[PDB]
Ligand SMILES: O=C(NO)c1ccc(CNCc2ccsc2)cc1
């Protein structure tokens with residue numbers, strides 16, 4: 224399986240610029256590329272990526288997305304003086320030309336194709352191309368919005384042609400609408416395009432009626448274009464995450480793409496003068512992380528915009544950090560999306576309910592500027608520690624390790640004297656294991672998480688939970704797959720309990736989420752709907768300092784456990800301890816793999832979830848979203 228992250232960059236692409244005064248074009252400057260690469264070097268991230276050389280896109284490759292007439296016209300700009308370059312630029316909207324931009328445009332496109340080849344050939348797991356000029360406004364026969372050729376559109380067409388891919392997801396988190404990409408694929412059901420964008424009721428550039436939520440695609444492509452317009456500026460981390468949990472992710476995981484391309488413009492970040500949004504650079508670590516379980520991790524990030532040189536550097540680093548597998552930063556202060564965003568989200572979910580299973584229930588009434596510098600993200604020396612049953616060695620990834628100090632055995636003895644009587648000296652070894660593993664996870668930046676096999680559940684959970692609380696980790700999220708009651712107190716806002724079980728138990732209060740799904744062929748899609756629509760929104764708002772996972776010995780969800788384990792590491796900087804009750808070699812090996820940062824096998828498209836399950840899940844949302852507003856995907860009723 225593949226490893227490493229490509230970083231594709233060439234300082235040649237910084238060698239064109241604006242040659243006349245035009246305050247509207249003043250902001251697209253060569254220093255965007257230098258500052259972004261220099262910031263990756265400063266943080267040691269460029270050095271950890273495989274540098275892959277830039278190349279020129281060939282004429283045949285340019286013609287996958289552009290017309291001969293347009294290519295021939297752009298091919299003449301190297302020979303133009305400034306006057307002729309000005310006259311040529313003015314035939315297009317918000318774009319300037321330079322003697323070297325044709326050269327650089329061919330490099331930006333070839334760079335993008337280099338990234339596609341490295342990922343699809345399994346030479347790297349994923350990667351990023353830092354390119355200029357950007358691509359996503361570019362169209363078959365026109366330059367537009369600083370774009371000459373459509374870098375991302377190239378990549379999807381090239382990947383279709385040369386790797387025979389049937390499903391490609393393009394995520395455009397730039398702050399502008401990538402209409403070039405929408406036009407290119409509006410009739411193609413094999414490319415799914417998602418874009419959020421500053422819109423302001425069509426008053427924001429490019430001022431297009433078809434950037435609205437009602438553009439779903441055309442003909443065979445209906446439902447494979449998703450526009451989420453932002454109708455006010457100042458959108459926050461909560462707005463972006465609500466967009467992911469309630470629009471993009473439910474559709475992406477159902478589409479099940481074979482490759483993910485990101486149109487990664489960072490003008491959607493705080494401080495940018497074009498976007499005027501308020502999302503912190505750290506949010507891009509999570510936008511990246513949330514998409515990485517797709518397509519076995521095959522993800523091509525390509526730079527588009529971003530004009531605040533400071534927030535540009537930081538959001539590029541957060542992105543590459545996440546591509547490299549580094550632990551994600553904690554996101555605090557999450558809440559409801561604002562009313563404007565909830566309206567946009569509700570509107571796109573409704574118009575898309577004809578085409579996607581996660582929105583289907585909406586169709587029938589029977590069912591319906593300065594900001595703090597980001598903290599450091601040092602990867603753990605050994606990411607994952609594992610404690611199998613005694614004397615069971617197993618092939619572990621190069622960054623895992625097996626596990627009892629004298630200090631620890633004293634604590635275990637102390638705890639048993641006071642709270643347990645018990646003398647099964649094996650489940651006493653379990654307690655030294657749990658405590659040894661927990662103390663490495665928290666006291667050390669050298670271990671990130673771990674998994675422990677245990678015999679007796681109740682004493683296991685108590686010591687894990689209590690040792691973590693009294694450590695102190697302010698908040699602990701507990702995710703329990705099994706039935707019955709555990710020694711867990713949802714008494715205060717220090718513990719939130721997610722429980723996935725098989726008996727429908729009434730839910731008391733807003734610090735427990737109990738999911739009882741009907742067992743059958745639909746159990747897998749239901750679990751994914753709950754994960755993306757219920758569990759992740761609450762968990763992100765809760766913001767735990769540790770995640771405690773618990774599986775009782777009984778199989779039925781061996782297919783989704785790796786997706787949950789990967790996604791749940793967006794919380795608590797990845798600090799998760801999993802307790803597996805009883806040895807199960809497959810579940811144990813699956814758990815360690817996802818904890819260790821490995822790629823997760825695709826789910827494939829699965830059987831649509833049972834309506835009874837969706838009913839259960841929306842009753843949970845109704846019950847919890849007044850407390851946990853990141854669960855909202857409709858505007859609330861005013862009094
Ligand atoms: O980053 C971008 N896209 O991803 C981006 C940024 C700025 C602009 C210019 N808009 C103002 C204008 C309209 C006519 S002339 C000047 C276009 C695209």
Ligand SMILES: [K+]
Nearest residue numbers: 395397399419
């Ligand atoms: K966009």
Ligand SMILES: [K+]
Nearest residue numbers: 408411414447
């Ligand atoms: K499409």
Ligand SMILES: [Zn+2]
Nearest residue numbers: 397399488528
């Ligand atoms: Zn932009």
